[PDB]
Amino acid sequence: ILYEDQQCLVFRDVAPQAPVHFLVIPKKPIPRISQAEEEDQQLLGHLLLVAKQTAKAEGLGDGYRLVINDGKLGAQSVYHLHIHVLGGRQLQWPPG
Amino acid sequence: ILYEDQQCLVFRDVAPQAPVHFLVIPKKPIPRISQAEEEDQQLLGHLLLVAKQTAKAEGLGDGYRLVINDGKLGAQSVYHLHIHVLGGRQLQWPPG
Numbered sequence: 001i002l003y004e005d006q007q008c009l010v011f012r013d014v015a016p017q018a019p020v021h022f023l024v025i026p027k028k029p030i031p032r033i034s035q036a037e038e039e040d041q042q043l044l045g046h047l048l049l050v051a052k053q054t055a056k057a058e059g060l061g062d063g064y065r066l067v068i069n070d071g072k073l074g075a076q077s078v079y080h081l082h083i084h085v086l087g088g089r090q091l092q093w094p095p096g
Numbered sequence: 097i098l099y100e101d102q103q104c105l106v107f108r109d110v111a112p113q114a115p116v117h118f119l120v121i122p123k124k125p126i127p128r129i130s131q132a133e134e135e136d137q138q139l140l141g142h143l144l145l146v147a148k149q150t151a152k153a154e155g156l157g158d159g160y161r162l163v164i165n166d167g168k169l170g171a172q173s174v175y176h177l178h179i180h181v182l183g184g185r186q187l188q189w190p191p192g
Contacts (some may be wrong), residue, residue, distance in 0.1 A: 017190035019133040045141035063167025067191045071159025075189050093171050094113035095163045
């Protein structure tokens with residue numbers, strides 16, 4: 001566990017796709033970004049701020065990519081909201 | 097222009113990497129996600145909510161991917177914060 005507070009949990013991905021690959025997830029039951037609502041605004045901003053602070057702690061100062069997958073075409077596997085943070089290698093384009 | 101308010105602008109990417117590819121950018125001078133601050137929490141959540149509402153308007157109900165690039169290793173080209181939204185095809189894994 002890299003980081004935890006009352007709103008979120010941050011842990012290493014179990015199938016890492018980069019030398020650093022971690023997940024930022026809310027504790028609140030949001031299944032996917034398409035089903036977030038206006039009441040989630042503050043939490044969503046929090047998750048992004050946690051992602052960028054954890055990226056600093058993991059040594060991603062030369063750059064990184066944040067990814068949120070929605071649904072089948074986004075390749076979302078588990079229907080709970082999660083933000084991927086990938087770094088420690090050159091990320092390519094397109095992003096899948 | 098897909099969407100605009102006092103806080104953000106949404107427009108099609110000029111080098112699209114999917115059948116739907118648009119950008120959500122803040123009007124505020126944030127250069128990259130690594131340099132966002134606590135005062136940006138509300139705005140960051142807003143940008144994600146705008147992204148997901150615009151994805152619905154663009155017909156991305158079968159899924160999509162949100163991407164934020166930071167720095168050289170993230171393949172960030174222009175140093176102003178922007179969220180990519182890609183859909184309308186199967187997005188692959190890894191995400192670059």
